[PDB]
């Protein structure tokens with residue numbers, strides 16, 4: 814197997830900045846205690862690609878989570894805040910677009926490479942949070 818464009822995401826990343834994450838979590842429906850503990854976390858994200866399977870691991874003092882998926886193919890995901898969601902992740906012009914559906918609700922998480930950073934934009938009903946990761 815040769816290189817893939819998505820290899821640009823592969824590596825070990827650490828959170829360096831976060832904006833509006835509490836408001837994003839409020840819009841998602843996260844309860845008070847989870848919002849406070851999750852908002853304190855400074856996760857590391859580990860992204861790897863093996864064939865068609867992309868794996869994203871998140872490790873923090875709050876929770877450790879992992880998803881593996883194939884682009885375009887829906888999967889079950891239990892989120893760090895304990896939502897059971899149906900997820901589909903696709904690549905749109907270099908951006909990983911992750912849609913989560915649950916309880917008649919929907920949120921979109923976009924992950925993109927900007928300069929040497931990995932920028933994560935979380936969007937729910939007009940509320941956006943931007944989380945910036947740098948190489949660990």
Ligand SMILES: O=C(O)c1ccccc1Nc1cccc(Cl)c1-c1ccc2c(c1)CCO2
Pocket residue numbers: 838841843851852854856871872873874875876877878892893894922933935944
């Ligand atoms: O956090 C990110 O950048 C992030 C990116 C893409 C997608 C989700 C992300 N985070 C969260 C989103 C909603 C609710 C929670 Cl609770 C978290 C979270 C908050 C802290 C935490 C974890 C998850 C796992 C490791 O620690």
